Amino acid sequence: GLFGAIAGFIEGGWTGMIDGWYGYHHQNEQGSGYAADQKSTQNAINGITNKVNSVIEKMNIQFTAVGKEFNKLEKRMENLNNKVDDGFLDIWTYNAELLVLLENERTLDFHDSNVKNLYEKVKSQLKNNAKEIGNGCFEFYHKCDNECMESVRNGTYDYP
């Protein structure tokens, strides 16, 4: 990963999450459970949705394109027509394949970045009230409620 998070200091994903792409897990006495961070997952959705729609939109509709006939004494013209169709086809095939290859890389790195930033947003929130354990996880020192685990998932959380 470009930002070190995904497939990085956070070895794998959670098949247990089904509310989004990014989220959390808690180890309280009231129980455990996964929860997606709507904020970051939504932004990620609006952006990727915009990316796919931009790619689709730039490729406006292809109107009627047909072949043409040339008599036996029009071989040069027939070959010019051939050079034109093949030349454009080469360019469009090239553009499409490159655009997809390049954006996919950009997209994967995008997610990696979101996870990294989400992790940091939490780390800077908790500060000294917890330690960084198995990468991605945090062990609270004061132990805190479910209503408090929420304060963490929502950016609030009050105490150093």
Partner: protein, 323 residues
């Protein structure tokens, strides 16, 4: 009490390519390449195409006896020829500017076939039953449905001159032919005059034709030849035919209506009662995807043709089930 920050994962086996790595399994992705089509030729926005079948543009427009089933068709969304469209010209010869004529029909949405020169009343002093075994029908010598072979009458071929004023309010496609006997005897026998000529003129067309007599290899068992010509008579204009022999006169002409999006395609697929916005020679397409790898020939509103085998855009992320 521990809170962890993580990311989604699932059982998806979708794969996409990146610049640094190929076949990367991801959680969610979208396909941008349409690879599925109907077979089947369909109506384009409710309008059926013209299926020439065993005939080609030439056989259709000249009225080759084996294309009669096409005589009544008046409108279409596109034209379809098949690999078996062999029935075109039936009497050997050259079809001048045939390719351009095809291009012209490519923007025609419909037309009316009408009698520019009625068989009975237009040629009082000439025979019109001229027929040939090269253009046979039902095992009997026949002739083009839209043309008339004019020949000598009672040992005489009077210099003819016929006019037609275009009052259709549209361009009228007129076709005609010039017959070339293989020898002088035939020329004399069919047209009386040895040094005949044909003249066809309009406000913007001016051509003269002279018989070029000589022995030639037989084609469809004919040493003779017939050259075919055509013009577009503008609304309100007049066309004048003048000749003292060799004229294969127009009998039916076409009042043309122009449209957009049509074209001529070659296909061996079959016509069914389906409707589409996008047709290819292999089958119809119903899709919103930006690309397609089905066929470069398209009629209507279609995705852009590309040679690509796969174009998939990753939306989700690297999928690490961590099983």
């Amino acid at each position: 009490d521990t809170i962890c920050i993580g990311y989604h994962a699932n059982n998806s086996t979708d794969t996409v390519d990146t610049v640094l790595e190929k076949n990367v399994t991801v959680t969610h992705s979208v396909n941008l390449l349409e690879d599925s089509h109907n077979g089947k030729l369909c109506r384009l926005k409710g309008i059926a195409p013209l299926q020439l079948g065993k005939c080609n543009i030439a056989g259709w427009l000249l009225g080759n006896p084996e294309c009669d089933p096409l005589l009544p068709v008046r409108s279409w969304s596109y034209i379809v020829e098949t690999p078996n469209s062999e029935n075109g010209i039936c009497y050997p010869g050259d079809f001048i500017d045939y390719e351009e004529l095809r291009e012209q029909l490519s923007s025609v949405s419909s037309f009316e076939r009408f009698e520019i020169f009625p068989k009975e009343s237009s040629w009082p002093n000439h025979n019109t039953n001229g027929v040939t075994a090269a253009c046979s029908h039902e095992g009997k010598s026949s002739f083009y449905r839209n043309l008339l072979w004019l020949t000598e009458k009672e040992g005489s071929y009077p210099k003819l001159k016929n006019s037609y004023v275009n009052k259709k309010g549209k361009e009228v496609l007129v076709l005609w032919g010039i017959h070339h006997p293989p020898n002088s005897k035939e020329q004399q026998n069919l047209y009386q005059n040895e040094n005949a000529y044909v003249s066809v003129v309009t406000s913007n067309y001016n051509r003269r034709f002279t018989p070029e007599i000589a022995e030639r290899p037989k084609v469809r068992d004919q040493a003779g030849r017939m050259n075919y010509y055509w013009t577009l008579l503008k609304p309100g204009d007049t066309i004048i035919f003048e000749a003292n022999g060799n004229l294969i006169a127009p009998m039916y002409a076409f009042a043309l209506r122009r449209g957009f999006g049509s074209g001529i395609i070659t296909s061996n697929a079959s016509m069914h009662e389906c409707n589409t916005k996008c047709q290819t020679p292999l089958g119809a397409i119903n899709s919103s995807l930006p690309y397609q790898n089905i066929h470069p020939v398209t009629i209507g509103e279609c995705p852009k043709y590309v040679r690509s085998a796969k174009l998939r855009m990753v939306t989700g992320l690297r999928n690490i089930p961590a099983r």
